[PDB]
Amino acid sequence: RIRAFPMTMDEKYVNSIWDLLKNAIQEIQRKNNSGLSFEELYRNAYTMVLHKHGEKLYTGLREVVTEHLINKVREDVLNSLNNNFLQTLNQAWNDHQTAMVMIRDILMYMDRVYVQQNNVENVYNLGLIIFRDQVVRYGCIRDHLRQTLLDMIARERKGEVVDRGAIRNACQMLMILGLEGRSVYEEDFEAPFLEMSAEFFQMESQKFLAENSASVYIKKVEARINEEIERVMHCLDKSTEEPIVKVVERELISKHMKTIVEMENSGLVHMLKNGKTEDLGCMYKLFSRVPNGLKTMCECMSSYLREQGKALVSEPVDYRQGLDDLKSRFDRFLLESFNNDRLFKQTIAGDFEYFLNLN
Amino acid sequence: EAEDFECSSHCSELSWRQNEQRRQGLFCDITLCFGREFRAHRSVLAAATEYFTPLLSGQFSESRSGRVEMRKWSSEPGPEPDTVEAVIEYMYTGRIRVSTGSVHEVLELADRFLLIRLKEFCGEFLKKKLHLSNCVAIHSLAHMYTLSQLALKAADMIRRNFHKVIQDEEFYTLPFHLIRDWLSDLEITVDSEEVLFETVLKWVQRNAEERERYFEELFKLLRLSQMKPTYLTRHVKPERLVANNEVCVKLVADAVERHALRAENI
Ligand SMILES: [Cl-]
């Protein structure tokens, strides 16, 4: 029949088991994992959890990891602030990940029995929280990592050559420390990155509008969108593509919509007058990215087309041909440049229905 | 056009053929010591449970040894060789026969080697076989090997027949931590709170030299207020185990004063 042999574990025996595991964890942190028997270390951690001493093992594990990352790892990163900071931080990050894998393996029974039962973070996630809080988001390190990464992106945009791999490793690290989330990456990197980028693009638009034509400006916005996407694919996290493109669109297009379209001797009306089909198509494609973009183009076109139409209905067969030549011209613009857009077609029709009813 | 093929027997064939290789010791690369040694395949064991992955990884001593020594079991010369063979064959075939006499070792081997589905079956096997005759033994296994659903069902059965459980010798086999938990439990059904004190004295007397140190903590768990003042002076106070501990003397002294103060309050 069904048998059971539960035994009481002596307090002095629990301490000797923990002392053996504490030493093993410390030896793994020192990268001296060779010569350690997995089965005997697993069994010791198993015996502790099995005899309901999982809390002592969990509290102890949290203590040993914290002691190591504050007294050894934090100091190594703090001593490297002005001498290979990213190289030392990533080395500390790779050393932590390697150590935590072996530590979670030895305490595997605790990870499947104790952490599940007592609604606490698993060995690997606890290790990430301790690394995140005591190293990456400590203060001097957090501010310097933010200063380093942003200074590199600011330098790269100015023409300097930077280690893109070092940025990718730092961003990958900030993402993982988010614990299957982007909270750490968003707060520490993305938020100040979008702030300093918006300031850069605002000043970029100011220079380009002051010396380049509307056509050249539109080409330079497309070039900046592509440069910022290529930067996300090689340095940052894939989830930063939409927020950075939106900032490029806000600072280079949205905030200068009426300025670009009404640019004296280069804008929409100038393109309409000289029949610059390709340039209008490029304007349509760029302004269709932002809200009220095509509306601004339509309002600018409507004002001019109505002014031309009112001048045509005021000034026998030549008068009828004038309205037909104006219709054929804008029908070409609608198909060849405005991709036969419903809004542009309604505007062209609406303007024609206004001045043809006037006279 | 392209077509997809699925071999109907391939799943069952691969498992049985690798198990026949193991029984013949063919292509085996690992030795499992429990004594009798069990030759097996690293690829199959690492596929059966997450436990063998770091053991045979290369970062630890065992990968360079080729033999793994499984020690510190419930029994001195390890679990039953036929039971170990059944658990190793399970890691290959996925099929196992569990009996009422082998369930405790199958559960010990499944829990230790993180065989979740086999641990679940053992829990479901003990759930269907749960009765007042084996409730104390099943609770001990469920509490030991974390079978929360089974532990609740077995505990809810003991809480109802505690008067019958404390009558049988099976309850006095239980270790201190379980005895302390049952005394701390408030939903347990007992005819009198005086019976609870009589069971503590019977438990300590079973192994006098090994359970005399636990009497002080167990006496503090007893509800002295619910017991009659006549029993507290004539049977509780003259006991040898209570007279030795000074804090246990003050506990029954404060209890007698509590009964006198409550009687005058009416
Ligand atoms: Cl025109």
From Swiss-Prot, chain A:
Brain, spermatozoa, and testis (at protein level). Widely expressed. Changing residue 269 to A: In NEDAUS; decreases interaction with KEAP1. Neddylated. Attachment of NEDD8 is required for the E3 ubiquitin-protein ligase activity of the BCR complex. Deneddylated via its interaction with the COP9 signalosome (CSN) complex. Residues 1-25 are annotated as: Interaction with KLHL18. It is found in: Nucleus; Golgi apparatus; Cell projection, Cilium, Flagellum; Cytoplasm, Cytoskeleton, Spindle. It is linked to Pseudohypoaldosteronism 2E: An autosomal dominant disorder characterized by severe hypertension, hyperkalemia, hyperchloremia, hyperchloremic metabolic acidosis, and correction of physiologic abnormalities by thiazide diuretics. Neurodevelopmental disorder with or without autism or seizures: An autosomal dominant disorder manifesting in infancy and characterized by global developmental delay, variably impaired intellectual development, and speech delay. Some patients have seizures, others have autistic features or behavioral abnormalities. Additional variable features include cardiac defects, failure to thrive, or brain imaging anomalies. High-glucose conditions in renal tubular epithelial cells lead to up-regulation of CUL3 expression, significant increase in CUL3-mediated ubiquitination of MRPL12 and dysregulation of mitochondrial biosynthesis. Core component of multiple cullin-RING-based BCR (BTB-CUL3-RBX1) E3 ubiquitin-protein ligase complexes which mediate the ubiquitination and subsequent proteasomal degradation of target proteins. BCR complexes and ARIH1 collaborate in tandem to mediate ubiquitination of target proteins. As a scaffold protein may contribute to catalysis through positioning of the substrate and the ubiquitin-conjugating enzyme. Forms neddylation-dependent homodimers. Component of multiple BCR (BTB-CUL3-RBX1) E3 ubiquitin-protein ligase complexes formed of CUL3, RBX1 and a variable BTB domain-containing protein acting as both, adapter to cullin and substrate recognition subunit. The BCR complex may be active as a heterodimeric complex, in which NEDD8, covalently attached to one CUL3 molecule, binds to the C-terminus of a second CUL3 molecule. Interacts with RBX1, RNF7, CYCE and TIP120A/CAND1. Part of the BCR(SPOP) containing SPOP, and of BCR containing homodimeric SPOPL or the heterodimer formed by SPOP and SPOPL. Belongs to the cullin family. This is Cullin-3. The chain holds residues 17 to 381 of 768 of the full protein.
Curated annotation (Swiss-Prot), chain B:
Residues 135-237 form the BACK domain. Residues 28-100 form the BTB domain. Component of a cullin-RING-based BCR (BTB-CUL3-RBX1) E3 ubiquitin-protein ligase complex that mediates the ubiquitination of target proteins, leading most often to their proteasomal degradation. Component of a cullin-RING-based BCR (BTB-CUL3-RBX1) E3 ubiquitin-protein ligase complex. Homodimer. Interacts with CUL3. This is Kelch-like protein 11. The gene is KLHL11. The chain holds residues 67 to 336 of 708 of the full protein.
